[PDB]
Each structure stands twice: as structure tokens, then as C-alpha cells.
Write a protein that binds this DNA or RNA. Structure first.
Ligand code: 0KX
Ligand code: MN
Ligand code: MN
Length: 379
DNA sequence: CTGGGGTCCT
DNA sequence: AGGACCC
């Protein structure tokens, strides 16, 4: 049976968070910077040619009057992200997160209830909320069109509630599966919404100019396909199943070829509480071991506060480094430390330092470009 | 001048 | 422990 799925992506998420805190940034072009990367920027900046994930120098060069704010601490962004997720969970309990600013909600049950409440007179009165992709004509006698229109109404209610209770704006897309909702949400940006009626699905899927634009096909998979003369959605649709499996494996091939047709049987999973907490630090150089112990101390402090806040306990710790391509060592967290979660710091530092020395030899000079710590295996 | 996070699979 | 993917 056919579902109704909604996808929500927040507008310039980090930048919008910053503009809420410091309204003086509301009308100036704003970029959010982590080290040498303008990770996002408000739409004023995008008018002047700034783009997401530009270099700082490319951003200032394409817009010298750009105002930069540091986004290396994701605390406020994370808080807001979960405020949005909890808000959406009021509508339907089952909400799936995709990173910090995107959410999927399966509206099927809700839509059915709303239709059950309706009589025959108002069925003619049902109207779309927001955009209809490709200006496709609505057939009120088509039940799928009716249900998707109801989904557009619920989506507008969600966006409005996000603005009224969280001051956040974003785009939504309503479709029959997660792939099509996520693809259709970004058609009209920012702070708009689009519904995709079934007849336009193929159109939407062929509007893409390369397969990498499909969620599920990343850099590596895209490269492997590029090497096979596959450059369009149709090249992947029309490629031979057997050859594709032989090159990419069975599961990957079948799934991504199903995606090239706009098909997504995957359900909306409940994300719930985080499966892991982590902190990262990048830098130009780290070669003094006591420097590394200081960085790990710093990461550990914040991680400890966050773990304390959740009220859940991690049963595993990891340490990740990058050498001047990424490597990690993990180990379980001793039970008495877990219970104490007391100067839990010093034992944690000792453990993570033993892992560090397992990874890298202090006797030989070394050059590390990233130190990250992860508390996972939460219970 | 290539961040700082996350998920699940193998 | 690493690898693929997502933002
Ligand atoms: N590679 C990435 C992608 C996103 N992000 C963060 C910064 C973004 O503000 C936030 C949301 O990512 P995004 O939706 O891809 N772009 P953003 O929401 O900023 O603007 P829109 O174009 O979506 O309106 O995740 C990141 O830190 N590193
Ligand atoms: Mn966004
Ligand atoms: Mn996003």
C-alpha cells in the first residue's frame, strides 16, 4: 500500500541558529566557519556568490564584506536539532533524523485519520498547501492525490509550528517514499514546500544531472559508476543488472538501481536517543604527546558533561587519529568508572592515552592532524 | 585553506 | 577496525 512521507530540511541551519542569537547578523551576509571552511552561509551571502562549504579565502574573495562566525562548537545547533525532532514527534511518534537539520515523518496513519473524519462535501474542498512539483494537475478523484494533499497540509502545519515554537524556518517535501520526499523538498528554497504527485516521479528523477545527487550514491560508488560509462540516471536505470552486481556487489547494485527509478521500500525508522556522542579537534600539527593528552583532556571534559546530561551510560570508548587515512582504537569502559559517571577524568585520560600509544610510537617523531574521542555503546 | 559531527554494514 | 554512506 502507498505511504505518505514528509522530509524537512532547515534553512542555512547553523547560520539561522546564529542569526537567532545575534539579530544584528540578520541582514548582513553571514558565513559559519569551522577552521578554513565556510560550512554554510545565510541566503544574503548566497546572493553575493557565497556557497556552502567554500574556503574562507574563496568566500571572502567572492564577498569581502562577509561576516564570519565560528561554528566549531555544535552545542546550540545540536540543542535546536533535537528541539525540532521532538516537535515533529508530537505529530507522529516515528521520526527519523538525517544529520542535524533533516527529519522524515511517516504521515500515512495521520492522513488516513484525517480523511476518515471528513465527509463527502469537504472531499471536493481539499486543497494543496504550498507547491505542487511540475505544476501537475490535481485529480481530486485520485485517492493518492487526496492523501498527498492532506500530507501537504500536515507539512505546512509542521513548518508553521516550527516557526511559532522554535523560530526556525525550513523546507518540506511530501511524497510516497523517503527518497522522493527528500528529493522534492529542496525544489523550492528557502522556507517553501513541494508535494510530488505520482505521475511526476520520473520527471523529478530525471531532473537530476548526475547519479551522485541521489542519496545512497556517494563519492566512491559514483566514481565506480563513472568508470563504467554511467553518467545519467537513465544510464543507471538501463544498465545491465548482472554487470552492475559483479562490479558493486549484490545489495549495493540492487538498491541503487531501485533508487535510479525513484523506488524506496525502506521504512521511516525511529531515531530516538543518540547511538553515540563524539568530539573532534583538527589542527595543523600535533607532535608533543602532552599536547595530545591536553587535547584529549579537553574533548573528554565536554563529552563527560554531555554524557552526564543524557542520563545514559556509555559502555565503550574510542580514540581516532589522522596521520600527516584514519585509524582508531577502542575498548570497553571499566564498570566502576561507568557507575561513578568522583574524578572520572584521570582514569579516562589514562585509558585513552594507552590507546593513543598503541596507535602511535612516541619514540619516533610523528605528525597528527586530528584527534577525536567517541563515547558509544550507550545503555 | 578539507569541519564537526552522525548512521549502519563488513 | 575499517568502510561506506548521510548532513
Ligand atoms: N558537510 C556538512 C554539511 C552540513 N553541515 C552542517 C552545516 C549546515 O548548516 C547544517 C545543515 O546542512 P545542509 O542542510 O546541507 N545546508 P544548510 O541547511 O546550511 O542550508 P540549506 O541549503 O539546506 O538551506 O549541517 C556541516 O557541518 N558539514
Ligand atoms: Mn538545511
Ligand atoms: Mn541539510
Amino acid at each position: 500500500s502507498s505511504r505518505v512521507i514528509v522530509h524537512v530540511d532547515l534553512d542555512c541551519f547553523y547560520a539561522q541558529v546564529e542569526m537567532i542569537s545575534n539579530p544584528e547578523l540578520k541582514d548582513k551576509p553571514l558565513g559559519v566557519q569551522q577552521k578554513y571552511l565556510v560550512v554554510t552561509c545565510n541566503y544574503e551571502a548566497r546572493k553575493l556568490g557565497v556557497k556552502k562549504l567554500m574556503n574562507v579565502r574563496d568566500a571572502k574573495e567572492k564577498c569581502p564584506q562577509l561576516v564570519l562566525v565560528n561554528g566549531e562548537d555544535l552545542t546550540r545547533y545540536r540543542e535546536m536539532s533535537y528541539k525540532v525532532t521532538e516537535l515533529l514527534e508530537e505529530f507522529s511518534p516515528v521520526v527519523e533524523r538525517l544529520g542535524f537539520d533533516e527529519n522524515f515523518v511517516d504521515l500515512t496513519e495521520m492522513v488516513e485519520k484525517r480523511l476518515q473524519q471528513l465527509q463527502s462535501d469537504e472531499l471536493s474542498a481539499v486543497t494543496v498547501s504550498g507547491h505542487v512539483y511540475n505544476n501537475q494537475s490535481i485529480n481530486l478523484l485520485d485517492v493518492l492525490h487526496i492523501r498527498l494533499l492532506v500530507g501537504s497540509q500536515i507539512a505546512a502545519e509542521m513548518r508553521e509550528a516550527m516557526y511559532n515554537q522554535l523560530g526556525l524556518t525550513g523546507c518540506a517535501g511530501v511524497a510516497s517514499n523517503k527518497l522522493l520526499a527528500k528529493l522534492v523538498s529542496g525544489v523550492f528554497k528557502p522556507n517553501q514546500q513541494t508535494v510530488l504527485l505520482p505521475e511526476s516521479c520520473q520527471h523529478l528523477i530525471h531532473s537530476l544531472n548526475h547519479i551522485k545527487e541521489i542519496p545512497g550514491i556517494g563519492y566512491k560508488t559514483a566514481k565506480c559508476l563513472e568508470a563504467l560509462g554511467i553518467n545519467s540516471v537513465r544510464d543507471l536505470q538501463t544498465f545491465s543488472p548482472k554487470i552492475l552486481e559483479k562490479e558493486l556487489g549484490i545489495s549495493v547494485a540492487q538498491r541503487i538501481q531501485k533508487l535510479s527509478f525513484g523506488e524506496d521500500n525502506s521504512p521511516v525508522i525511529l531515531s530516538g536517543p543518540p547511538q553515540s556522542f563524539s568530539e573532534e579537534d583538527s589542527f595543523k600539527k600535533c607532535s608533543s604527546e602532552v599536547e595530545a593528552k591536553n587535547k584529549i583532556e579537553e574533548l573528554l571534559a565536554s563529552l563527560l558533561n554531555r554524557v552526564c546530561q543524557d542520563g545514559r551510560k556509555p559502555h565503550t570508548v574510542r580514540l581516532i587519529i589522522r596521520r600527516y587515512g584514519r585509524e582508531s582504537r577502542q575498548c570497553p569502559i571499566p564498570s566502576h568508572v561507568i557507575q561513578k559517571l568522583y574524578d572520572v577524568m584521570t582514569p579516562m585520560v589514562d585509558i585513552l592515552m594507552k590507546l593513543f600509544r598503541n596507535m602511535v610510537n612516541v619514540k619516533m617523531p610523528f605528525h597528527l592532524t586530528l584527534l577525536s574521542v567517541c563515547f558509544c555503546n550507550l545503555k
